[PDB]
Amino acid sequence: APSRNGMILKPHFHKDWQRRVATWFNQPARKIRRRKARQARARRIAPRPAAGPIRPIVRCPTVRYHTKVRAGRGFSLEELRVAGIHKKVARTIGISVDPRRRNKSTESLQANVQRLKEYRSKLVLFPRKPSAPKKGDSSAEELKLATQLTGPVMPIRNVFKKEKARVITEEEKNFKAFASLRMARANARLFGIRAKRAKEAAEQDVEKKK
């Protein structure tokens, strides 16, 4: 029985919902359990960073988010091939690798290679055995300065580039943004019909000539 003025409501409570009720009193205790396991993991990998392997620079799909940059699943094989790192050896030195990723662009391919170049410089590699330091390991003084890195290793900051104030030229002054937007709207809509119209129009010229 509705009142004078109000909404039409659809409460989804017609099932036996009282049996399946999830309380959240575990949340303050869960946060301690997440923290204690995270701190215990960090002491297990005490020289290695707590975040883990590095993540690539990733553009978003779904054009709503297409101007944003995230941290990804792993570096592509094309990005590792340019950087000169074998795919089975990068995983032991803290590089996330996945074979699913593609490389359609060159800017993002070069950005991750540049990201991999600065990671190799910042990586302090311990020798396999302390008695015999090998060729590709760090120097002896870098052993004493090896420390844990808190937070995400090399955080991916969506940096924006500043631009200086320019003097407007005549091409920018006389440009018609609305007219160009309306015109490109029509030609994309009318691309197929004009192509079809020019298709059979050749056979009306052939039949006229013959």
Partner 1 sequence: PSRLRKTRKLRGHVSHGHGRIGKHRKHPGGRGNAGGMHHHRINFDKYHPGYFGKVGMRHYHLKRNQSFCPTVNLDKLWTLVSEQTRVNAAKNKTGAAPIIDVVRSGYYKVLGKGKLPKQPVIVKAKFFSRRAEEKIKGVGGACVLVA
Site for RNA in 143-162 (CB under 7 A): 155, 157-159, 161-162
Cα radius of gyration (the chain):
30
Q: Which position among 40, 43, 102, 107 is part of the footprint of RNA (CB under 7 A)?
A: 102
**Site pattern 38..77 for RNA (x: CB under 7 A):** xx-x---------xxx-x----xxx-xx--x-x--xx--x
**Beta carbons of 143 and 126 less than 8 angstroms apart:** yes
In degrees, rounded to 5, the angle at the alpha carbon of residue 184 between the alpha carbons of residues 183 and 187 is 90
Q: Which does 177 bind (CB under 5 to 8 A by kind): partner 1, RNA, none?
A: partner 1
Cα(99)–Cα(158) distance, integer angstroms: 25
Cα(54)–Cα(115) distance, integer angstroms: 9
Residue 151 found at the interface with partner 1 (CB under 8 A): no
- Taking CB under 7 A as the binding criterion, the range among 99-107, 137-145, 201-209 that sits at the site for RNA is 99-107
- Taking CB under 7 A as the binding criterion, the range among 125-133, 139-147, 201-209 that sits at the site for RNA is 125-133
The DSSP H or E segment spanning 70 is strand 69-71
Cβ proximity to partner 1, 124 vs 184, nearer residue: 184
